[PDB]
Design a binder for this molecule. Structure first.
Ligand code: SKM
Length: 260
């Protein structure tokens, strides 16, 4: 039976658990799919082109992670769904010898919840991961405030029409976040401390261990959440696509939940 190759592009990449959850699905659904899928971590030079290399390795699909999501958006041949208004894609597909981009962090992060009760939120960090979040919450009608001491391309949220800050809003929020090329190892403990209190939900993109960020977070007897549930939702959605839509996301989501 056919070996179809896939992977997650990134740098760094060794800690990604995408291979675990996608391979659970390829094995589970090969009868329905009619090929053997194999998903693998691909560590990418920062200087390289995802496009040239996706074809070099003859992938059929792939995810994109830090820091290639916007670089990725550029080199598609076609871009579909919410991606058009995200300027970042996390999912690639060869369809008809055409490279097609999607973005699943959006919906992914959204489905990450669960009960449709919320009005606004505050996004620390100015990355592709946050771009799709913002844009994702707007669509789900929210009052979205971004905050990053970084500035360039912070216009995106501006052009998109949400409130941009380089100083914590003397305000009170239902969701705080973080999507920083920092965290390795955010914003000063105090500016943080004050905001965190009377927040409705905490939430960190990152998964694996407990981050400085959340480590504290929970400590303050707060409702919390980490990247796990999102990782799975956005993967199941990318899988649906990988399956050229033969496998529904939510079926994938069950298989994936039950290994990780
Ligand atoms: O760690 C991972 O494998 C991933 C993380 C997120 O950025 C996702 O958007 C990406 O598709 C996969």
């Amino acid at each position: 039976m056919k070996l179809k190759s896939f992977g997650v592009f990134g740098n760094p990449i060794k800690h990604s658990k995408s291979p675990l959850i996608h391979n659970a699905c390829f094995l589970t659904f090969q009868k329905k799919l009619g090929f053997l899928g194999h998903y693998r971590p691909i560590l990418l030079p920062l200087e390289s082109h995802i496009k040239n290399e996706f074809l070099h390795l003859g992938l059929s699909g792939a995810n994109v992670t830090l820091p290639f999501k916007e670089r990725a958006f550029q080199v598609c041949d076609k871009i579909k769904g919410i991606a058009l208004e995200c300027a970042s894609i996390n999912t690639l597909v060869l369809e008809n010898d055409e490279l097609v981009g999607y973005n699943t962090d959006a919906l992914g992060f959204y489905l990450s919840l669960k009960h449709q009760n919320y009005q606004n939120a505050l996004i620390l960090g100015s990355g592709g991961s946050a771009k799709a979040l913002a844009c994702g919450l707007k669509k789900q009608g929210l009052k979205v405030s971004v905050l990053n001491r970084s500035p360039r391309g912070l216009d995106f949220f501006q052009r998109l029409g949400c409130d941009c800050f380089m100083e914590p809003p003397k305000s009170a929020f239902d969701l705080i976040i973080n999507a920083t090329s920092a965290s390795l190892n955010p914003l000063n403990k105090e500016v943080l401390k004050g905001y965190f209190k009377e927040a409705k939900l905490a939430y960190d993109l990152a998964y694996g261990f407990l981050t400085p960020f959340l480590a504290l977070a929970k400590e303050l007897k707060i409702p919390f959440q980490d990247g796990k549930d999102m990782l799975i939702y956005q993967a199941s959605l990318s899988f649906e696509k990988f399956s050229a839509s033969q496998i529904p996301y939510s079926k994938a989501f069950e298989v994936m939940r039950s290994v990780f």
